[PDB]
A = this chain, B = another copy of it.
């Protein structure tokens, strides 16, 4: 009705007075800061840390835990809910990690939401402005539809690689970061499909079906080793850190950065394609955002761990060597795509220099952080062998 039937303690005269009467003269404690006991990474504790750190109920037998005792219910066999046994890496405290962008759920979906609505505005402006007229037909129907489209399966696979980590991560801060790295990958896979669906609306005859790109990924040659690597990283790795590390600090840093930045982002412009770079801008923004987190966890926290620094670097060095070979193969196969381009699009020198940019950025941003002795010319020469 008018006032409704339910009476509320905050506004109901009779109830509020009862409540007000029972209240103390002042707060029963002056420390009004939730998470006051958490060690601040920066000057002052952030909202990100307070709302996140120690949310995971780990006992002290899992580095950094504040609880005590065994789990209340374990798996048949005895496997604990969470345990040190789910990863080779060791640390003094699994809660030391901090996403440098301090992303908790609200800030995360806020930014992605902004990106979504602006993406919608961009496409409506792009279509209404008829910019599709100046795009090379071959680049559009052959390279975007088939090859860029096939790449969605690569990103999809890398997304799935995070499934076990979402379950096994040994701390809240690592779990949130991990979940967001994976969610950004599924988002890119979907944006690749979104572009294909948009083109199908503005270009008569363009088929948005994933059949062609999927066949390219599952049975083609250009992406064969890429697919073999993704399949391994995803389903053959049972260690959540080996997965997150090898994916972001090895495979995606070399293959992913080469394909997105040195191939599509670099050449689409040459064929009058400003559409694909719009989406690749998002993918690259996300890549750099994830890198900051990846670096803080594996290098600042684990690779520089006061007690396990040497150990962790030996393990990561091991994982780097294990995953660098399949990654090189993935790049080597992809070189086959350069032979498909119209003559004069690019040459061996441009292709070589671009390989070196990816390899040099990788050595600087990752390899060097654990003292992995990477030989840049040896890696590039191994890849160039794939040039037909």
Contact = CB atoms under 8 A, between A and B. Distances in A.
Interface in A77-134: 111, 113-115, 117-118, 121-122, 124-126, 128-131, 133-134
A215 B3 CA distance: 68
A128 B167 CA distance: 31
A178 to B, nearest CB: 20
A131 B261 contact: yes
A27 B126 CA distance: 49
Copy count, this protein chain: 2
A114 B109 CA distance: 12
B285 A274 contact: no
A149 to B, nearest CB: 20
A13 B10 CA distance: 9
A265 interface: yes
Nearest to A277: B274
Interface string A10-39: 111110110010011111000000000000
A281 interface: yes
Nearest to A114: B114
A71 interface: no
Contact of A269 (B23, B124, B272, B288): B272
Contact of A288 (B10, B111, B128, B134): B128
A357 interface: yes
Interface of A: 1-3, 10-14, 16-17, 20, 23-27, 111, 113-115, 117-118, 121-122, 124-126, 128-131, 133-134, 261, 265-266, 268-270, 272-274, 277-278, 281, 284-289, 291, 354, 357, 361
20 contacts: A2-B23, A3-B20, A3-B23, A12-B16, A13-B13, A13-B20, A16-B16, A111-B121, A121-B285, A122-B285, A125-B284, A129-B261, A133-B357, A134-B266, A269-B273, A269-B274, A269-B277, A270-B270, A277-B277, A278-B281
